[PDB]
């Protein structure tokens, strides 16, 4: 009931758990055999992005639709190479040309981020609105950033 | 038969009713749980409006059609944020792209 960083304390073994302290420098040695060529995987062409909803909130209050025109249907990953937005889902399924939904949480009031998707990337941009409740019962999911300007 | 503001008068209890006087300052504390996200409800895109009929009258003599292109069919509200026009109906039903 007094430890810093919100640590829980247990006695067998003597230990502290769930300390929200620092970061873990993970290093991954991925074998050369596990990689797959760009040609095999679904290749995306002529994509467009739009934030059909944005709630600047701790949880994934942000929704964005990506209109896609894929070279072949299947499944492939989605990411944001920046700390502006953190996505709920890792990969999405695609059917020729259509639309897909991406959930995310954001820090920027005027969000703009490069959504990397399936050997391409689309510049998602929009304006975002404040959340409902002052206090929430779970920790932050989106990386804080300096920019929250007009 | 003489009261101001058109009040009706009754005797048990002694009282006046239907006095068209003043206004009531209503205050509503709406719970946070009753609100619904914009994403869930039907979202309207690329709407157009036209007054297919207007009769400046005490009753709802004015008619207007809204051509809509909705994101998903359902029901949702309609209002006028101004004192210029007062609507008879509160909400309307929408079917993909059409008219209401």
């Amino acid at each position, epitope marked *: 009931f007094t430890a810093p960083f919100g640590c829980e304390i247990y006695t067998n073994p003597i230990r502290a758990e769930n300390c929200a302290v620092g970061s873990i420098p993970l290093a991954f040695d991925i074998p050369d055999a596990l990689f797959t060529r760009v040609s095999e995987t679904p290749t995306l*062409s002529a994509a467009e992005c739009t934030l059909n909803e944005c709630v600047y909130s701790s949880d994934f209050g942000g929704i964005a639709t990506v*209109k896609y*025109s894929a070279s072949k249907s299947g499944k492939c990953a989605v990411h944001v190479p920046s700390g502006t937005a953190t996505l709920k889902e890792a990969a999405v399924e695609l059917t020729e*040309q259509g639309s897909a939904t991406i959930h995310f949480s954001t820090a920027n009031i005027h969000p703009e981020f490069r959504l990397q998707i399936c050997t391409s990337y689309v510049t998602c941009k929009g304006d975002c609105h404040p959340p409902k409740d002052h206090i929430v019962t779970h920790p932050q999911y989106h990386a804080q950033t300096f920019t929250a300007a007009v | 038969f003489t009261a101001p503001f058109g009040c009706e008068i009754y005797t048990n209890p002694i009282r006046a009713e239907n006095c068209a006087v003043g206004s009531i300052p209503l205050a509503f504390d709406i719970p946070d749980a009753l609100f619904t996200r914009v994403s869930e409800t039907p979202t309207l895109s690329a709407a157009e409006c036209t007054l297919n009929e207007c009769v400046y009258s005490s009753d709802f003599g004015g008619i207007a059609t809204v051509k809509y292109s909705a*994101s998903k069919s359902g029901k949702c509200a309609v209002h006028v944020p101004s004192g210029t026009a007062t609507l008879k109906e509160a909400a309307v039903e929408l079917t993909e792209q059409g008219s209401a």
Partner: antibody
Amino acid sequence: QVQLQESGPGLVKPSETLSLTCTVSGGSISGYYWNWIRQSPGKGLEWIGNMYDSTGDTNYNPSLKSRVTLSIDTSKNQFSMKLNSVTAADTAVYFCASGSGDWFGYFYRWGQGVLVTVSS
Amino acid sequence: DIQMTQSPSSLSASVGDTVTITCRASQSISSWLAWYQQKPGKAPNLLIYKASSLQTGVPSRFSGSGSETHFTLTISSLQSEDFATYYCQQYISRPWTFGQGTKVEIK
């Protein structure tokens, strides 16, 4: 939402070019895909190909690719089909709809279809 | 192309009967499958999109299910206006294709 209407029915001579237009009303062609599908009376539906509204790219049925051209006409809010070197095997009802796929609702509108008879 | 195999090709039924039509894709199409109804001399009509979503204006006696390669169209209790040809279709893996159709005739 969207209404589609194929141009009128009639004859095309063997070896000549079948040409159809689809006119969209109550909606623009500035989104989605725009498609032609045909049906030989009594039989099934065969997808011919599509044009993607936003970028104009086309995809064709492999069995027809060598003979088919699709195009979009922004000035009339129309799109068209050209099918070269027809034979009697191309007699069919041709429908124009938002086939392939759209970023929010496709193939929800199917043109009533127009009968093209290939005949000498 | 992705080959769509519809089963059965023909079905005889009576008003009130429960009807099931199956659709098999040559490869996985996740949930990207639509069902259409077509009557003689008329254009197809969308009934179900993305395997299980009922199109607005379509009665709830129509329902769709399945994912991957196997899909099902169920008509809970067949009505007179339900006698027609039904087609499945996948918008997936170059290109988009239809099943051969299921003709539902009056027993």
